């Protein structure tokens, strides 16, 4: 267990680029980490965005968030680069702005400021 609740991380999920996140406790499982059905470790994260979402992410797709400029280093992991779609870039920029504000906070302040409120349907 390398991450705890309130830690800032980058997550690489689905078709999306490396995205700013905060580790949090799953609202139903009440754990922030688990061993999945394939026997691998996963972390529960909140994506920083104007569209709040959460996901369980494989530990190999999670990295410590040290700052927004670290994005280049994650891409490093003729030069070939994927283009950046406008709508997705705008959502990522909002997320980064939140992550940069969260980085100036203590872990306790971040937990209080950003932990999602979940409402049953």
Helix (H, G, I), strand (E, B) or coil at 49: coil
Instruction: Convert residues 18-57 into a mask of x (bound to ligand EHT by CB under 6 A) and - (unbound).
Output: -x---------------------------x-x-x-x-x--
User: Which of residues 16, 40, 73, 113 is near ligand EHT by CB under 6 A?
Assistant: 16
What is the rounded CA–CA span in Å between residue 9 and residue 7? 6
Distances (CA, A) of 106 to 6, 46, 102, 115, 116: 9, 17, 8, 14, 17
Give the shortest CB-78-to-ligand EHT separation in angstroms.
28
* Listed ranges 2-10, 11-19, 28-36, 58-66: which one lies at the site for ligand EHT (CB under 6 A): 11-19
What is the rounded CA–CA span in Å between residue 51 and residue 100? 17
Give residues in contact with ligand EHT (CB under 6 A): 13-14, 16, 19, 47, 49, 51, 53, 55, 91
């Amino acid at each position: 267990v390398k991450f705890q609740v309130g830690d800032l991380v980058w997550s690489k999920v689905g078709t999306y680029p490396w995205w700013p996140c905060m580790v949090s406790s799953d609202p139903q499982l009440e754990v922030h980490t688990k061993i999945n059905t394939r026997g691998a470790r996963e972390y529960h994260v909140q994506f920083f965005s104007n569209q709040p979402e959460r996901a369980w992410v494989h530990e190999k797709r999670v990295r410590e968030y040290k700052g927004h400029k670290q994005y280049e280093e994650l891409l490093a992991e003729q030069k070939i680069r994927k283009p950046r779609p406008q709508r997705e870039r705008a959502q990522w920029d909002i997320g980064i702005a939140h992550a940069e504000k969260a980085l100036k906070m203590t872990r306790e302040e971040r937990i209080e400021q950003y932990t999602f409120i979940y409402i049953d349907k």
